[model samples]
Target: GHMKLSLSPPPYADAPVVVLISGLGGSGSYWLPQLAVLEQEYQVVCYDQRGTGNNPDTLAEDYSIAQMAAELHQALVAAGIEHYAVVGHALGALVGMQLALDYPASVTVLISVNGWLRINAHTRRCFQVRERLLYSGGAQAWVEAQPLFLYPADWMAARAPRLEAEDALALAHFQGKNNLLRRLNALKRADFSHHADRIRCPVQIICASDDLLVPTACSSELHAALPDSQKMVMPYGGHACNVTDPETFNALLLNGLASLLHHREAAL
Candidate 1:
């Protein structure tokens, strides 16, 4: 079954295409800040992962990076996008890696935010805690734990109201406990280190220094494996830096896209 997707066309003709994929249990709304700005320069496509948000319910329990990538690729093809830039965060980035590897010609620039090539002990522990909390304590515990896992402590306090609103939204659209566990399991089982060097497209890795879930070392590890990738670490913003510090995130992302486009144009 196709996932829920929306494509916001660029204001002008001939604009390039950019696809945004969200992290675990999150819908396309996570990409709102980036989409609001990116749409001015490129056509933006946003979709929810299966069994999450507005996506049709799924009974299939097979959760793997390859499966996630295939489903997304099928949706994109059905949406009429042949080749495009893919920018994904966390689990979404893992799926993006598989997508680029499985359909080499379908992706141009690959940008991964707060992502990793393999699940390290630290990362695995983080997800394990979430899984345990969800199953044992319930969704409220899961929601409450997010700020600790996703943002820096000071920032969490600083942006209390906004964070609260986001938490409420998250709870409202929360996927069931079983679905969350399945997605987490898929992430735990994913290891894309073998294909990192095979990715021929320009790759960009964005890391947040204060990220509690996936450390900067994880992003560095991925950058080291991708022969053609560059890494950027934001000093303050945490895991959800795109939302906490969209201004900085957007600046770096736009600059990367601009540089990639310029180089491609020059080669032509």
Candidate 2:
């Protein structure tokens, strides 16, 4: 029911904190690039979502977005994180949004990468395809199809060997079929439109132009719903832009944080 968390300190004694939340089927390792890039300036906290990646089995029959956010609250309290910025990708981004809505004062800023507020027809179809593949061909087929939705063609083709290795790694990390289905069900049932207006913190929605899994339209929808939120589109890199193009992603992330800091300082 609880998440596995890791807190990493920066070189400075009083560094600001940033929490990195991974997507469905992802572990803290998902934030390796961001961790390496931001650790110099910010204390980084990473965690594996409940029911996945070293975490204990969930007691609930099905997961809900609200419950995930509540668990996030528990993890933050356990880690003694009073205030922080949050960066979440995919499913993790949804969790971050829920957290900001439920615990407004805890989050200073929120960055949502490749996340959506509702499940559209396209999104449903994509998940259905993934489910069918998983059932028919098992983990290998599921992992193989992932790159097509997460990375650009040139990027995927350029690193065939590495991708093959990643496939094996993903196979190892593949949370059993039941868990995956439970998550998919949760995602299908997720609808955050009602709570979007409740998020008071600065929010930045980053989406990949060619994201097949979660389309740019979804990010646009979220931007429209959150009156104060801003949206950015990476020209390429599919869904996992942070992994495929960390330089651009990190630059945008840093810039967003800086802008927030500047605005806060001005207000002070």
Candidate 3:
């Protein structure tokens, strides 16, 4: 079977491509918010990461973030995509940076949300708690506790019933614990600061003011280090700002993506 890459092209046959990548969960569904917004203007792509979503295979012995990026690039090439833009969140965000560095000419722009060049002590400590949850109570407990790390208190509470419903499906499609841990460790070991300057395309960093897990400082640090980058912070939305506050996230993101695309297009 073909690798599970999905493409939804915009109205025009020649529309620019935008690939959306997910965070720690590695599920393509995480991009539902941005996906809906981008579909109208860009040829949108989303794929389930190996060992994630409905795929239940074990990860390779020594999987790394670079390997993940390489796999994505290969997948895109196989799908006949050429130049593209990337919009990634957290773990996926890190992978996008690596993609831009490794394949500079193929990537036109990179938009990272709640991403980090290095998993700092703060984010590492948060991952520790998540690790403990996964090991102690399996996917059920971890999924139950996920919103706490991703969404604001009031927001999650108001949508309790809807969240509870998804909990069942989440466990049903839960990626294996071993694979999850492996991907977690891969994200932790990733340190792009030294080579971030080598990234050839423009980057837009998006951070949420209330994000507790990744912290706003991570994005700020990334903005300062990258050679070509800009940043914007949402007033609130916690870690998964794009999901929690789609209205604001979509507005800011659409504007930034358009401006970046326009700037690049004009230069050509």
Taken over the whole model, the C-alpha lDDT of each candidate is 0.84, 0.83, 0.87
Report the C-alpha displacement of residue 194, candidate 2, in angstroms. Answer: 1.9
Summed backbone clashes in each candidate are 0, 0, 0
Candidate 3 C-alpha error for residue 217, in Å: 0.4
In Å, residue 206's CA in model 2 sits off its true spot by 0.9
Q: Which ten residues in a row have the lowest lDDT in candidate 2?
A: 259-268
lDDT of 2 by residue, 137-200 (tens): 9888888898787789999899999998988988887777777777778778888888788877
In candidate 1, the residue pairs with backbone N, CA or C atoms under 3 Å apart (3 or more residues apart, or in different chains) clash, namely: none
lDDT of 2: 0.83
Cα lDDT tens digits, model 3, 47-162, are 88888875457887588999888888888998888789999999999899989988888899999999988998999998899889989999988998888989999998899897
Candidate 2 collision pairs: none
Error of 2 at 258 (Å): 1.6
Best-to-worst TM-score order: 3, 1, 2
TM-score of each: 0.95, 0.94, 0.96
Least lDDT summed over 10 consecutive residues: which range in candidate 1? 259-268
